[PDB]
Amino acid sequence: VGSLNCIVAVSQNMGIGKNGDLPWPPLRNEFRYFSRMTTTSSVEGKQNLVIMGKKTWFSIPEKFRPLKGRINLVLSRELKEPPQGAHFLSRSLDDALKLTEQPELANKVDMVWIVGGSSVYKEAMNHPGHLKLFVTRIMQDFESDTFFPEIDLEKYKLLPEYPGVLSDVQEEKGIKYKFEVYEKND
Ligand SMILES: NC(=O)C1=CN([C@@H]2O[C@H](COP(=O)(O)OP(=O)(O)OC[C@H]3O[C@@H](n4cnc5c(N)ncnc54)[C@@H](OP(=O)(O)O)[C@@H]3O)[C@@H](O)[C@H]2O)C=CC1
Ligand SMILES: COc1ccc(OCCCCC(=O)O)cc1Cc1cnc(N)nc1N
Numbered sequence: 136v137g138s139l140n141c142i143v144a145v146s147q148n149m150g151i152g153k154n155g156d157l158p159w160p161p162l163r164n165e166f167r168y169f170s171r172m173t174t175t176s177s178v179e180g181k182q183n184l185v186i187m188g189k190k191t192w193f194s195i196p197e198k199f200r201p202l203k204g205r206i207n208l209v210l211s212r213e214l215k216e217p218p219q220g221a222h223f224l225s226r227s228l229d230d231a232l233k234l235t236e237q238p239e240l241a242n243k244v245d246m247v248w249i250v251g252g253s254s255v256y257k258e259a260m261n262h263p264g265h266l267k268l269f270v271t272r273i274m275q276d277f278e279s280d281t282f283f284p285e286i287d288l289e290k291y292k293l294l295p296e297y298p299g300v301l302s303d304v305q306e307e308k309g310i311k312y313k314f315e316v317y318e319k320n321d
Contacts, residue, residue, distance in 0.1 A: 136235045137181075139264065141249040141256055142172055143283055144271035144312070150279025152252065155194045158277035162307040165271060168314065171299075172269055173248045174204045181245035182206050186231050191251040192218060206244065208234075210255060228258050257284040260291075268317040269300075275310055291317040 144165060145151055150158045176183050185202050189211040192200070200220045201207035208223040208231050217224040225231035228249075235244050249259045259266065268291060296302065297316040305312050 136241070136247065137178065137245045138267065139232075139247050139249070139259070140267045140269060141259055142169060142269040143251065143256065144169070144273055145283045146273045146275060146277040146279060148276045148279065149282045150277050151283050152194070152281035153277070153279045155190065158279045159273055159275075159310060160308050162310065162312070164305065164307055165312060168271070170202075173202065173250065175299075176245040178245040181243060183246045183248055184208060184235060184240070184244045185248045185250050186210065186225075186228070186255065187250045188252045188255050189214065189218075191255075192221065205248075206240070228255060228262075253281050253284060260284060260286070263321050265320045266318075268315075270315045270317060271312055272315060273310060273312045274304075286317065290319040290321060292319070293317055 143151060144157070146158055152158065173183055173185055182205055184206045186208045187210065189209055192209045195202070201222060206223070207221050208225060209217055209221045210225055210228065210231065212226050214224055223234065225234055232247070234240060235247060249255055260268070268286065294316045300314050300316060305314070
């Protein structure tokens with residue numbers, strides 16, 4: 136199994152969601168960036184795995200579920216089987232990560248991408264080990280009801296460049312944003 140990563144787009148006030156959708160209007164190229172990063176596997180004969188909470192799963196429009204070309208794992212203690220369209224169900228992050236090493240997935244998974252929501256991000260970011268955060272900074276405030284957890288910059292070093300990540304300011308629908316990559320290893 137390859138790298139562990141989180142990916143998120145986040146407003147200035149740390150907002151990631153409102154009423155089960157994004158706090159801001161659709162940003163087509165930003166969605167493209169998400170799809171590119173999570174889908175692109177460095178390793179032949181493997182796919183990336185996406186891990187997400189139950190509400191994050193249901194927040195993705197049905198026509199885009201499962202996230203194509205990726206193995207889709209949902210976290211839930213209430214569900215008894217994976218939602219329609221989902222590939223796997225785990226009762227915890229540690230369980231999901233363990234599963235990735237089992238016979239059914241050991242040979243199949245390249246990178247793993249935590250795609251939300253708040254509680255999965257928090258546990259992942261606070262768990263010792265080698266972890267990257269792909270963070271898109273939406274450079275405005277947006278009314279939100281769910282928030283990205285604090286990034287501890289003592290741990291998470293902002294990388295000065297990363298291959299395939301544009302460094303300049305992007306803009307769609309009058310909203311400026313920029314891409315960042317953070318890395319910790321503890
Ligand atoms: N801007 C961005 O990049 C992103 C935005 N979002 C947005 O953020 C919101 C995210 O939703 P959020 O409210 O944080 O919900 P989550 O997706 O984290 O879902 C919460 C639910 O997932 C299960 N769950 C979460 N963590 C675990 C775990 N470790 N083990 C087992 N089960 C778990 C549910 O449990 P159960 O069935 O057990 O009760 C829990 O109630 C939505 O508005 C979405 O649009 C989401 C991802 C990215
Ligand atoms: C779970 O997070 C997401 C899952 C899917 C997604 O949309 C991508 C497909 C385009 C579908 C459409 O057009 O409606 C977006 C997210 C959120 C997200 C966005 N951006 C970044 N950088 N990270 C994310 N997690």
